[PDB]
Design a binder for this molecule. Sequence first.
Ligand SMILES: *[C@@H]1O[C@H](CO)[C@@H](O[C@@H]2O[C@H](CO)[C@@H](O[C@@H]3O[C@H](CO)[C@@H](O)[C@H](O)[C@@H]3O)[C@H](O)[C@H]2NC(C)=O)[C@H](O)[C@H]1NC(C)=O
Ligand SMILES: COC(=O)C1=C(C)NC(C)=C(C(=O)OC)C1c1ccccc1[N+](=O)[O-]
Ligand SMILES: *[C@@H]1O[C@H](CO)[C@@H](O)[C@H](O)[C@H]1NC(C)=O
Ligand SMILES: [Ca+2]
Ligand SMILES: [Ca+2]
Lengths: 1274, 100, 97
Amino acid sequence: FCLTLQNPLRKACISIVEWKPFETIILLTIFANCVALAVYLPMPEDDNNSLNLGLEKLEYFFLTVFSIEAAMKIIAYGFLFHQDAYLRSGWNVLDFIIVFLGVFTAILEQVNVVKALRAFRVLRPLRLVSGVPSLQVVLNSIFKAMLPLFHIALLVLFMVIIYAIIGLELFKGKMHKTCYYIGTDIVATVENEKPSPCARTGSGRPCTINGSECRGGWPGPNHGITHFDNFGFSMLTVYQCITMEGWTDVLYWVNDAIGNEWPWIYFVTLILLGSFFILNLVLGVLSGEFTKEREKAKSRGTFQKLREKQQLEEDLRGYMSWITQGEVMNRVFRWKCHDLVKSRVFYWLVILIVALNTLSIASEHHNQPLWLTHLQDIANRVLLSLFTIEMLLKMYGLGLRQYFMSIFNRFDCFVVCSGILELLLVESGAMTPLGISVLRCIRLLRLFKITKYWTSLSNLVASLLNSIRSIASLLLLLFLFIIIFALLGMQLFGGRYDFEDTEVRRSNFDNFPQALISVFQVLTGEDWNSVMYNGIMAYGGPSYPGVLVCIYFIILFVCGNYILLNVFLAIAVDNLAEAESLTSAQKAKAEERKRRKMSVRVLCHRIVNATWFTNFILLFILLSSAALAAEDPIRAESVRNQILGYFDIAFTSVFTVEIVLKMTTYGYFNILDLLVVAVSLISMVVKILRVLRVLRPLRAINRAKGLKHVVQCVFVAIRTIGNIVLVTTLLQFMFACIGVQLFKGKFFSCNDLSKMTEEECRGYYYVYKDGDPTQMELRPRQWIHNDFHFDNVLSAMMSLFTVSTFEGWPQLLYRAIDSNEEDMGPVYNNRVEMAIFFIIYIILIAFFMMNIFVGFVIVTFQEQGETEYKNCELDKNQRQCVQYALKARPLRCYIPKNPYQYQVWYVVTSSYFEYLMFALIMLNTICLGMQHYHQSEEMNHISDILNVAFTIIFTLEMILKLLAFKARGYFGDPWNVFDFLIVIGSIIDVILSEIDTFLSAFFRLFRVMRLIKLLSRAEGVRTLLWTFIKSFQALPYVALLIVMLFFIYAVIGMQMFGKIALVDGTQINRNNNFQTFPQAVLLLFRCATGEAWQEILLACSYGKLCDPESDYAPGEEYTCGTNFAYYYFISFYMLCAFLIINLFVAVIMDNFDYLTRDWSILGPHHLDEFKAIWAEYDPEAKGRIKHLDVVTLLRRIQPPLGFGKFCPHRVACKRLVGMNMPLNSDGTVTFNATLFALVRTALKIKTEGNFEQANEELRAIIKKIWKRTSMKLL
Amino acid sequence: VFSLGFLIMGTICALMAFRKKRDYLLRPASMFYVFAGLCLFVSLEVMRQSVKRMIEYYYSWSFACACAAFVLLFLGGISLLLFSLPRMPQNPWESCMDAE
Amino acid sequence: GQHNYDRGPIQWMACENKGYYYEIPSIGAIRINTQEYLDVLGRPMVLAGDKAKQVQWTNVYLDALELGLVITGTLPVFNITGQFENKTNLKNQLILG
Ligand SMILES: *[C@@H]1O[C@H](CO)[C@@H](O[C@@H]2O[C@H](CO)[C@@H](O[C@@H]3O[C@H](CO)[C@@H](O)[C@H](O)[C@@H]3O)[C@H](O)[C@H]2NC(C)=O)[C@H](O)[C@H]1NC(C)=O
Ligand SMILES: COC(=O)C1=C(C)NC(C)=C(C(=O)OC)C1c1ccccc1[N+](=O)[O-]
Ligand SMILES: *[C@@H]1O[C@H](CO)[C@@H](O)[C@H](O)[C@H]1NC(C)=O
Ligand SMILES: [Ca+2]
Ligand SMILES: [Ca+2]
């Protein structure tokens, strides 16, 4: 028993009680407690229906069942020592908190005759992950992955703190002046415009409304929630911009108040550094973790579990095929028919009648003709019997048994049976008015018959199938996380949206279904912050307890998108590594079988090929591409547009000269050099040609052999991929054909939502402004039709595409829920259960199928660095440690002499000086965070007392490092160069702040950039930053393609969309237009992010009106815009999203050694600290040191590199003589070769006589030695 | 005064760093050319306010001169900095301030 | 208002008591539903026949057309269709105006 104590067994047969079902009645009790929290309905102001009263009478019964078992485990176990032991166990504490925190609130309630103590009850569903151990191990593989990510999450925090401080300084207090009607407190906005700032006499947007005056006192831009005028609001609004959701409205607001020309930089830089760079780092680290994890499994035993059972299944079906033809094998003709069926001809005539069906499905549209309807009923009843015949013929032609076995022949059974089941159901009089829709839904299955035609992902789909044990368990614990949060949302925000506005806040938290939907919308990121502003306003406002709701909102986005990395990416890094290894395994299975049955002309060329000559042309492409971008779109009669036209006729003479001279010497990429030159001379349909004039820049790529080689790689990335691109296209067609059968005819609405159809929606109706019934305006009413609808299949697909991008999916979802009937107007919450289609599509496309697309480009690039096979005597860990030992080079330290300077030298390099001065940067942060808006005047001057008192300190750590290090040794470190710059930059600011009052916000950033000095101490952050900054700088070509793409799109965009008018209320306004090249590029950047990118597409599609400064014949004011916007916008979103997964994966795979390092055994992190101890024995390098200090070097070393936590008398004395080393004069053994045998010992350890054999290997596979190994051989 | 003076001081670090085999010294010479760059850009902003508070405005001869000496000194200073700071290390073995 | 609370009991109350039911979701819906109950209250007047056709004179009020102070004498018109034979009566319990 080993009880270690005990009272007798007078009642302690409680350990007998607990056998099989008590573990499962208390698992059934807890599921009944989660349905009682679900069916609760939160009502405003203490109002309750009668089911909420009977549900708090259920809570008492659920409070004792959980409360007696919490006593029957403190008696089934033993006395109090046992209690402490239990405390160690995680599950008991969780199960004891919940039911001690449950009796605590039932008694303060029952005394009281607390509505925030009711909240802890939501914690109950976690008690359910306690009673399943198959889910307890899924949580630990979540939490284990967390440690590698720590250096990132510390870097994100120090990046929000810089831009919260900088942003605050730059934009503090600026956004408090909105437009107002004269002599009134009504804010004056246009119809679809939100309230944005003004400026009297500055650079901002002045009022241009008929009767408005710009005055201060406005609280701020989103009910005062967003702005930068203390530290908590500055940092809430920098965190929001980092998640790329609503970062342009902040930028637009900032311009409007401060001005247009500078604040683009703070935001663009933040987005680029803050999200894209960090996203790449996080993604790379996680992937490395997965590879390491895969490594621990596959080398242990997990390869043979999936190889045998895939071979023992394919040997089983071969064994069962030898049976099913045997027992199976009355007329010879039938056999002949079967043979014909096997015959290929039948495989090009199953694709004939399946292609009839796709066409039939796609031809459903709304308000179609009457012949088109009846042809689909003819072709259906034909192809049902054609589908009948094949099944009958197939099942009767090759055997009834082995028809059963196929993964696709089972479905061919299901088609014709439920094909005839509909044709028997309607043709009995039993359409059943929903079933005439519900039974038509199933002949949408016939387009799934082409799934067998792939034979390409037939390897991966199968792998996926095995894994539906492993697929499902993480999705189970993401689903248990959306429940807890939904319940929590219900507690904080249920019944709290009682705003007296007349506007619709439809993503609320009132039911459980609605709460769940709201929670899902915050995880997809979509419009998540406009869900948060309703929750700050449901509490007080932007006040002290009102804004602490925001932390709850933040946790759901951060900790909930940590699960979505471990789920989806785990799937896409593990199950696309088995299905690749097995593809190589079926490849080593492949050709080993097929080997068995087998067994004056000279001068011009020189000038042209001259290097000097090339650099004269590639700065005429640099001038001609600045002339395309300087063009003015609206006014063709400008002096600018004329005088740039002479720069057209300058250069395209010179590229002609390049062309004709090129066909003096020589007799695909040069058919592009012919075309560009002809286009200009022709252009001096003209309109179409001009767009084809921006491709001059592309030709520059041949010019650069790097740019030649990278367009080749991008073209290669289109080879292996286009089965994923095909599979997704076939599925985007299945959801678009379900969505047509569900939402066709139904996205119409009236202008006022009382008039339910088109015959009614005619006339005028009254709108009411700000919900005031005394103030109304007449507006005509029209039968509007949604801009994204499901009305033919092509239309349905566009909507689905927009939804995958996650932009506007919430609007579409709401439109879908309200949809009424075939041609009527909407009903509020008519069919809430049509969220299932959208959610399923999102999980299927945007989560799961795009993540085997990032997980595919990776694994076909791991093998780009693995198809090169290095089977020499030295493995991976040898190349990254011996080649480092060849090419190593010593540091410097500069220990000086003249002991007056040595006095200053040791004071500065101490630990308690690095502790003093990295505790004064921490005080300079807090003095800069204390700044706020409308602070006091005593707060106003001590901020200038303090900022002058910090500058005198940091000027005096700079003199102490000049005199000690003897300034040659001072500008040797790059961190003393940067620290010299932040010192001098803040002395001038002390001057320039004080010559101001004795008689520049850019210099006040020299106070905050001294916080970057905190990277000089953190070793692990800086090795992470250096690794990627090295790689981005080593791969500029990869990013170049993105830049080239932006340049090409911007040039086209000014040319088509350039003449829309900047009317405000639309999405082409004074912040978001295509008028200038810088503006167009900014607009494109907004698109990479996906901000309202569909909206912009809608804005510029033909119907739009041209600005008055353009020219057009009168009466034709409404004729600009173009329909090319659909292609252009779709194209940019797809080319920019493919070049971004090409850039991320290219940078993850140049640092694959850092990321799959496994820091336990060895790295260069030991090889660094060797030299940093060797720096104490070398002032400058000189090669060698004395032998008296060699034994004192080995005492300083970590034992995985040197010698142990033991005493060095036996092992470290004997080995240093016995293991080899070069013997020069007494105190001369070199740096370059002592480090060799010191790491040749720790691994790659060899016997004697073959000390030439390590030097034999160090010349073949190794990078050239350079002649330095002649002391590293000996 | 600071934009002119800083430039003069910067020269004294730069003129003395081409002799006696010292190149560390240049590092500060590139600092003062960014500062002399940015102390015209305050000047540029300071001169704009005078014309904005005071009848039209047009600059021809010496705003676009100094806005070509801002962009010269501000960007010939940052590039001289990165053309004198050693390199990004590019290899796991290498370190900044690496010998020779 | 726009809400999810159950409307069956309220409709039942209206039906039980010979009243009527009216929704109002919006401000523009207030004006025609808070005047519409006089179609119900006029019913036992249109079943009174000729006895209900009595002139009544209003309180003095300013004329819509700016005439000045005035009083109006009113009479209700009833919807009689197929009276000869008593054929319908489905909507014959409202006043024409
Ligand atoms: C006075 O009462 C009579 C009935 O007692 C009202 O006449 C009825 O008016 C309705 C209006 O909805 C007519 O119904 C319509 O029938 C047409 C077919 O012509 C159909 O297309 C419509 O959908 C609707 O069902 C109905 O014909 C008519 N009844 C009779 C018996 O004529 C009349 O409206 C009342 N007077 C006034 C001024 O309203
Ligand atoms: C990567 O390209 C995209 O940006 C996609 C997004 C965001 N949106 C939609 C729904 C896609 C689609 O369904 O393709 C048919 C594409 C897509 C995803 C994966 C593989 C291929 C494509 N594709 O074909 O464009
Ligand atoms: C703007 O308002 C003024 C004052 O009411 C009015 O006279 C003018 O007509 C309005 N704008 C135009 C273009 O008419
Ligand atoms: Ca988004
Ligand atoms: Ca968005």
